[PDB]
């Protein structure tokens, strides 16, 4: 097995990001077993990405658990090789050995440039990763087997580097979040252990690179009604009164000459009498406040039935004893109380002001840091208001609260105005074998965290894509909202609190289901006791549960009645037996895994029809694809990721290598296949080419620039890199280029792809026009013909599988025993698969 541990330090850059690029940390290996179970103990060190790096124990990609450096999102090093894309590439170092005890690894990642460097025991790793995707956040990660001991050296407070950081590289410990504490946590998980037992957990939540940006609303150009002199002056005066009162309560005083150490107010007059700059600043502040109010849905109103008179302006305690004092108060708070709308308006105005301030900061050049570094232009507070801690939130709110109080007292009648979908829902169900069809049964579920929880009974057939209660296959109950779901929502009972247990009592004998909370029966509007009733048994039901993102809960099937709670409260005297009572071993369940995989097209698909015709006239065997509901009601359009079920494998060594010419027919190693794009289908939304086996992109906003790419650049001792191997997972061209090369044309678009299994190049042609786009691959690689298309017509494409002059068809590459057969013949095994987001695990 392999276990990956991260140092809970996430660094990523973006356009306008506030995080610094260069980061350097260290790791020291202390103890290791040479051969765990006679097999050399695995231990890799490297960096990983937030989105795309989800290792799983057992049944990973390739032959085993991916861990570090087995995907296009994580990059690792194991002392002799660099791991990426499930490919180990040997790298030269002054010290070439597997990580032994008492071995110090140095790791440095500069976000600014796509480069990662490693250094084993002071011997730098000559090779580096380059030109990878920097989107998201990067974090250190170490994978290992049993029998090892390693210690982090993130620097500063946590750990200490055994070698000086490279020039410009800051210690990684400076990127710790202020709200959380540094720790060692897994990447993603679907379960947890606790005192009650196995607590299922939902998908973990993370931030994005675009979340940290400030996006304010400019209000300086807003024009205001003639309130500037009428009542804005009043507002200014009242703000000056409050400010002077606060300074009198503090140690500030009013001396005729301005001094900061002597605590002297520059004006030193009861009335502000501030000169033009000061007066304009203290006026324009309330002016911009009114501008924000009018820019929002708020409308100011100066009419207050001569409230200025009624306002008790005799709030003077004589405490002032300098030139500037006598700052009266109007008892405005007492006169009018802030409504919740006014309070949320204060929050929104403070957020907008801090937002413009943050934008000005980042524009000037400020970049977020754990601490404040004025010379290096770093500020912990420069993050957006929504991203601030509570201290700055309370610091930047009191003045706006007082201003809004003044507004109330002056009677302004202002009134305030897909891919993650399955990555935010985790479903757990029992194994279909456990389904029963007779007898009253019972199970319990404790909602450790209240929210996004649906618990109930579901038939063995459970569509992992659809939620619970949408299809009639489940009598689930969403207690978080207090509504039972079978085909829609239906209010029933009351929502639970934290730590509340829900008892689900199925009655196969009476065909009824009862949902109870903490031993108390939940009631209906009409008073029906059982939550469900009149239930056709059919295949049966299972204790199904659905948890939202990060949601935690304990599913107790009832193996032991001693640990089973509230069974004597409800179920024991009602004739209910706990689920799986006599089983010696715990029940095996099936959860919803969110790994995208290609699956064959269903013949009953609502919108995609797949024809297949072979031996046609002047056309080789071809498989056609056409939309079903186009130009009709109930029609939808969505991205379609398609692939073929059989690949073409390159040779082990890349040793070069009308009427058709026989010797070129017998000596050729290139193969052909064409795509016919039908009229009515916009060519700007079609893609033809190939994908590698390790392709897991289900982007509904797929673009040609969204393709994965990473370069393995191996060097020498002096740094003269000798390698530039470019790796990707898709090689499909866009149709828009060919349609621009040249309304609806009756001639279909013919795109012929050529592949050379011996030289190692993949080429494209379209409508008889050569395509500058070419690709070069490595030996011993298998490529599946794939197509990416947005359906926008009744008939979209047709995949012909044929041959050209002096060019064999793909069947000779497809079949070893049929390598010398020039006749094209689509294999019976061959089929078209489309990408599905969720599977069962």
């Amino acid at each position, epitope marked *: 097995y392999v276990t990956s541990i991260r140092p809970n330090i996430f660094v990523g850059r973006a356009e306008g990001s506030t995080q610094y690029g260069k980061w350097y940390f260290e790791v020291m290996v202390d103890e290791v077993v040479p051969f765990l179970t006679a097999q050399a103990t695995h231990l890799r060190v490297g960096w990983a990405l937030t989105e795309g790096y989800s290792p799983y124990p057992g049944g990973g990609e390739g032959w085993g658990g991916n861990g570090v450096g087995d995907d296009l999102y994580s990059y690792g090093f194991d002392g002799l090789h660099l791991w990426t894309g499930h490919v180990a590439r040997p790298v030269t170092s002054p010290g070439q050995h597997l990580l032994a005890p008492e071995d110090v690894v140095s790791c440095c990642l500069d976000l600014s440039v796509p480069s990662i460097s490693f250094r084993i025991n002071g011997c730098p790793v000559q090779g580096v990763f380059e030109a990878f995707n920097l989107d998201g956040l990067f974090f250190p990660v170490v994978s290992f087997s049993a029998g090892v001991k390693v210690r982090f050296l993130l620097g500063g407070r946590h750990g200490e580097f055994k070698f000086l950081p490279p020039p410009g590289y800051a210690p990684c410990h400076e990127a710790v979040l202020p709200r959380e504490r540094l720790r060692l946590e897994p990447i993603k998980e679907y379960r947890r252990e606790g005192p009650r037992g196995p607590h299922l957990v939902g998908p973990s939540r993370c931030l994005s690179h675009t979340d940290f940006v400030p996006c304010p609303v400019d209000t300086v150009q807003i024009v205001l009604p003639p309130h500037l002199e009428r009542i804005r002056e009043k507002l200014a005066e009242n703000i000056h009164e409050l400010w002077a009162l606060t300074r009198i309560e503090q140690g500030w005083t009013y001396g005729p000459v301005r001094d900061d150490n002597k605590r002297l107010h520059p004006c030193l007059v009861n009335f502000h009498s501030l*000169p033009e*700059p000061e007066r304009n600043y203290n006026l324009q502040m309330s002016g911009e406040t009114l501008k924000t109010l009018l820019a929002l849905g708020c409308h100011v109103g100066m009419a207050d039935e001569k409230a200025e008179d009624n306002l008790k302006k005799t709030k003077l305690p004589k405490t002032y004893m300098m030139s500037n004092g006598y700052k009266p108060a109007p008892l405005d708070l007492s006169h009018v109380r802030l409504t919740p709308a006014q309070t949320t308006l204060v929050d929104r105005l403070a957020e907008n*002001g801090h937002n413009v301030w943050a934008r000005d900061r980042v524009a000037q050049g400020w970049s977020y840091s754990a601490v404040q570094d004025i010379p290096a232009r770093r500020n912990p507070r420069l993050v957006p208001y929504r991203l601030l801690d509570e201290a700055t939130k309370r610091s930047n709110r009191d003045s706006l609260c007082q201003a809004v109080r003044t507004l109330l007292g002056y009677g302004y009648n202002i009134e305030p105005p897909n891919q993650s979908r399955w990555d935010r829902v985790r479903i757990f169900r029992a194994e279909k074998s456990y389904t029963v069809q007779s007898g009253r049964w019972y199970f319990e579920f404790e909602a450790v965290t209240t929210g996004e929880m649906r618990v109930g009974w579901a038939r063995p057939e459970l569509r992992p894509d659809v939620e619970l209660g949408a299809d009639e296959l489940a009598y689930v109950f969403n207690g978080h909202r207090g509504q039972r779901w079978h085909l829609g929502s239906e209010p029933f009972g009351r929502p639970w609190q934290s730590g509340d247990v829900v008892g689900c009592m199925i009655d196969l004998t009476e065909n009824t289901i009862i949902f109870t909370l903490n031993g108390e029966v939940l009631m209906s509007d009409s008073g029906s006791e059982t939550a469900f009733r009149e239930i056709e048994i059919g295949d049966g039901f299972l204790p199904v549960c659905s948890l939202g993102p990060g949601q935690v809960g304990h599913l107790n099937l009832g193996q032991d009645v001693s640990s089973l709670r509230f069974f004597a409260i409800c179920g024991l005297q009602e004739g209910f037996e706990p689920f799986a009572i006599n089983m010696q071993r715990p029940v095996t369940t099936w959860f919803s895994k969110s790994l995208p995989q290609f699956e064959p097209v269903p013949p009953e698909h609502p919108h995609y029809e797949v024809a297949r015709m072979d031996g046609t006239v002047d056309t080789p065997p071809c498989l056609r694809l056409a939309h079903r509901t186009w130009g009709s009601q109930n029609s939808l359009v969505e991205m379609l990721f398609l692939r073929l079920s059989l690949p073409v494998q390159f040779h082990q060594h890349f040793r070069c290598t009308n009427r058709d010419d026989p010797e070129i027919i017998l000596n050729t190693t290139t193969y052909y296949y064409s795509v016919r794009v039908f009229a009515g289908q916009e060519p700007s939304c079609v893609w033809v080419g190939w994908v590698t086996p390790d392709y897991h992109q289900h982007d509904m906003n797929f673009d040609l620039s969204k393709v994965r790419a990473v370069t393995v650049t191996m060097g020498d001792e002096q740094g003269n890199v000798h390698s530039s191997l470019k790796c990707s997972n898709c090689y499909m061209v866009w149709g828009g280029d060919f349609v621009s090369p040249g309304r609806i044309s009756h001639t279909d678009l013919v795109i012929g792809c050529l592949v050379d299994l011996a030289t190692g190049l993949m080429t494209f042609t379209a409508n008889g026009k050569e395509s500058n786009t070419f690709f070069q691959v490595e030996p011993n690689t298998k490529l599946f013909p794939a197509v990416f298309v947005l359906p926008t017509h009744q008939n979209v494409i047709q995949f012909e599988l044929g041959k050209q002059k002096n060019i064999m068809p793909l069947s000779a590459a497809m079949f070893l025993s049929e390598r010398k057969n020039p006749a094209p013949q689509c294999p019976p095994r061959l089929e078209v698969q489309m990408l599905m987001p969720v599977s069962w695990s």
Partner: nanobody
Amino acid sequence: QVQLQESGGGLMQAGGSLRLSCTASGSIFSINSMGWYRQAPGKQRELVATITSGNSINYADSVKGRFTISRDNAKNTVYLQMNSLKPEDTAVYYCNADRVPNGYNPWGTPNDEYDYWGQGTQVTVS
């Protein structure tokens, strides 16, 4: 964003006049305050005499000698002249411009953070 190009203070002996012309090129907005700071090599950075809008002058301990600052917000031009010299005056001067009004900020840390640093100039005394 204000760029404060400061040039002046060439090496000289004790009693030699050193002029320092600084230019705070940028928006003519929020030009009400102008400060100066000397970071002595490996030593604390002390506040030199600052002048706020309205020909207002604020002095400190580091103004000892003959500091004659003639900065004007009209054209963002600083003219810190130092006729006298002492051997402890060897410091990297800096030209910081800010929006703070009369050295007081009723609003708080937001506007306070509104500072624009400048390259500054090594001043050396033999």
